[PDB]
């Protein structure tokens, strides 16, 4: 039938993609980096421990200033911390306590928050009222909001349980682009440093590189065996790393649209909840379900460090803009700073 | 100390935030967290309405000086395993299975019956790694129609194995037993089973009894009495 003919065409195109990627592959990242020196023992010590959350931390996003930091927990509170002083700046009650994503705007004026309520809430931090109020409640997604990232003070990109990653205008509360094309729940989302592309990883074991301006998906990356729960761009917007439930975090590149390396260990059999890159992209930090985080040599696939200071799964992890200190969030109601 | 004046003021704001957080957490600590789960439009709306009288629906009620918080995830319609870990500390899951589903065979169209649909959903919820210690409040809502349904059709039409006679009492007992026997964790959690209806007004009382029993057992276990 015509459906069978179109399926045959799709299979032919998939084979063309696969053989084009095979032709592009000429020398592996491990092969090219075998001659480089190792990082050594990256011993990060806990410098700050942020206490005050009374439930499981589900999200955490550094501010651009590399000092302020927002955390989202299972109790309906978003606490903005001063990492340099262990000080709580703001404590925002939430309409819905079920949140798994929170974002800090690069300007610091707004903070984002979403979850199973299917609504992305933008809170205005800098108000003459002296308190943090909900600026706009963005609604229209038919699934739980898994991620949200600020492009500007007026644009946000959010990924949800449905196979859509809507791009919103905060002032009008409208979806500028729906960004459809996935076949599973989008679980992670990383804006490029240039802030025109972004990669969204979903439950379909595929990460798709979208285009904010034209509303389209240029590239689809495969290779993961299972759900992708964490995505993070390289410091330069030419590669990204995906954390999965198969205990492997793979480094995908945009230019050669192929996986560059797989960071796996035989002992590690737990899923990867959060993935973030250190500045310069040499170190890859992946938060695991085994109650501890691992620092990976992104250029050599070596477990060069283990940040074991949590009594539960490391739900979130991020690195400061200046690259000074990484932060870890866990279900033990503690957030820790490492350096 | 060596802090600045504005620094001490900010740290004071930090203590105030800590005090508010502790007060609100203590307030949330005494509130019973319940999860609504069902086969899909079976009896959840009716039971929540009778108990009171696009994302999570939270229903708050008070019965005998105990505050409740029931979360309904019927409208999620997504991969359940990605958000089912959120309700780890839930006191009990209120599972609503329709008795009228026994002769209904239209689950997900095809030729599969909604009673077995509710069976596998109940098995998945009860055997979840995050739900291994949380009791389940089973609720069978179509007791006012199951009598005529079972007097007009036999239980065997859904249950190939021996279903006994066709009377309402033993039919309900067999359904209850075969919904209770999927508990692989009989040592820890208890399936609180109740046959409700639209006219039933004691659903809130039964939920109160079940959650109070779970509280007493959790306290016994924590104290080492169990």
């Amino acid at each position: 039938s015509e459906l069978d003919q179109l399926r045959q065409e799709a299979e032919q195109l998939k084979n063309q993609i696969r053989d084009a990627r095979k032709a592009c592959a000429d020398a592996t990242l491990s092969q090219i980096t075998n001659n480089i020196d190792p990082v050594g023992r990256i011993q990060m010590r806990t410098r700050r421990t942020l206490r005050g959350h009374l439930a499981k931390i589900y999200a955490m996003h550094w501010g651009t200033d590399s000092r302020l930091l927002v955390s989202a927990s299972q109790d309906g509170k978003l606490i903005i911390w001063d990492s340099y002083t262990t000080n709580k700046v703001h404590a925002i009650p939430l309409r819905s306590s079920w949140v798994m994503t929170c974002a800090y705007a690069p300007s610091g004026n707004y903070v984002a928050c979403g979850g199973l309520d299917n609504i992305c809430s933008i809170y205005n931090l800098k108000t003459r009222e002296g308190n943090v109020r909900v600026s706009r409640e963005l609604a229209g997604h038919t699934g739980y909001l898994s991620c949200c990232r600020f492009l500007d003070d007026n644009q946000i990109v959010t990924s949800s349980g449905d196979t859509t990653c809507a791009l919103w205008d905060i002032e009008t509360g409208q979806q500028t682009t729906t960004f459809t094309g996935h076949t599973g729940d989008v679980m992670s989302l990383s804006l490029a440093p240039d802030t025109r592309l972004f990669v969204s990883g979903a439950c379909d074991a595929s990460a798709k590189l979208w285009d904010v301006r034209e509303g389209m998906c240029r590239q689809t990356f495969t290779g993961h065996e299972s759900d992708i729960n964490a995505i993070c761009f390289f410091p330069n917007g030419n590669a990204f790393a995906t954390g999965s439930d198969d205990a492997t975090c793979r480094l995908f590149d945009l230019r050669a649209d192929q996986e560059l390396m797989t960071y796996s260990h035989d002992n590690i059999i737990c899923g990867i909840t959060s993935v973030s890159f250190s500045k310069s992209g040499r170190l890859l930090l992946a938060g695991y379900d085994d109650f501890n985080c691992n620092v990976w040599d992104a250029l050599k696939a070596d477990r060069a460090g283990v940040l074991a200071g949590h009594d539960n799964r490391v739900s979130c992890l991020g690195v400061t803009d200046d690259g000074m200190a990484v932060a870890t969030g866990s279900w033990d109601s503690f957030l820790k700073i490492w350096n | 100390c060596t802090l600045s004046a504005e620094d001490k003021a900010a740290v004071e704001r930090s203590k105030m935030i800590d005090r508010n957080l502790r007060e609100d957490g203590e307030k949330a600590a005494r509130e019973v967290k319940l999860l609504l789960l069902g086969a899909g439009e079976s009896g959840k709306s009716t039971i929540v309405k009778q108990m009171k009288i696009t994302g999570i629906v939270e229903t708050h009620f008070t019965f005998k000086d105990l505050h409740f918080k029931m979360f309904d995830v019927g409208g999620q319609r997504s991969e359940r395993k990605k958000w089912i870990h959120c309700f780890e500390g839930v006191t009990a899951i209120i599972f609503c299975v329709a008795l009228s589903d026994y002769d209904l065979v239209l689950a997900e169209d095809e030729e599969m019956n909604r009673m077995h649909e509710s069976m596998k959903l109940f098995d998945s919820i009860c055997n979840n790694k995050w739900f291994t210690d949380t009791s389940i409040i089973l609720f069978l809502n179509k007791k006012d129609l199951f009598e005529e349904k079972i007097k007009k059709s036999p239980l065997t039409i859904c249950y190939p194995e021996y279903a006994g006679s066709n009377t309402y009492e033993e039919a309900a007992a067999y359904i209850q037993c075969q919904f209770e026997d999927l508990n692989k964790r009989k040592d820890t959690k208890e399936i609180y089973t109740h046959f409700t209806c639209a006219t039933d007004t004691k659903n809130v009382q039964f939920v109160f009894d079940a959650v109070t029993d779970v509280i007493i057992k959790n306290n016994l276990k924590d104290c080492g009495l169990f």
Partner: single-chain antibody
Amino acid sequence: DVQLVESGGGLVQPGGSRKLSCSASGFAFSSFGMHWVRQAPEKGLEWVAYISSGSGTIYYADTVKGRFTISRDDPKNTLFLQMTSLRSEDTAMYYCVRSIYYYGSSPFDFWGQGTTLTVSSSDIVMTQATSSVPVTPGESVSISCRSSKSLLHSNGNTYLYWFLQRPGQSPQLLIYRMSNLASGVPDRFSGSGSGTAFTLTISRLEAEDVGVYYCMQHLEYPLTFGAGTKLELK
């Protein structure tokens, strides 16, 4: 939106007691630490008292240490300043200044209309050597403030605050801790300083830019205001 309407004052005999009251408005009075700043009829500003959010720390000035009591009530959004002993030197018009404190806060933002209390008959020093300079609109000018003690702190933030008191108007914060412009203030005002001696430069002068400018410190709580620098129009 934000208002701080003061009440109380007037002609009272020397030695009496009057309770100055501030009716706060929709600015979350519970989350703000509130100050009292006085102004003699032809003199500068001087900090009087302070209460923190939740009435935690209650600081007073040396001259009113054992005579003035600052108190707050978060319900009804009202701030009180009970003055027990009244000298003839308390014939100042008092201002109720709100102040919030976190990392990126802007303390001393709103100042309030103020009320006049007429009575019949160590601390850092800010000099502000310039007290009156002729200035014409459109010309770039600068003001100078000097600290007896360096306002730089190990936290890395100088604590000089600049206020512009327009003729017949309450002081308005131009810049909080220097180089940090306030909200609602034009960009023509810039700060900069050297820890001990500081400057405030104005790029362009307008009709609303003529007034008496004050420099304040928040490093130590005495909160000394320098003698105002007056900009003579044209």
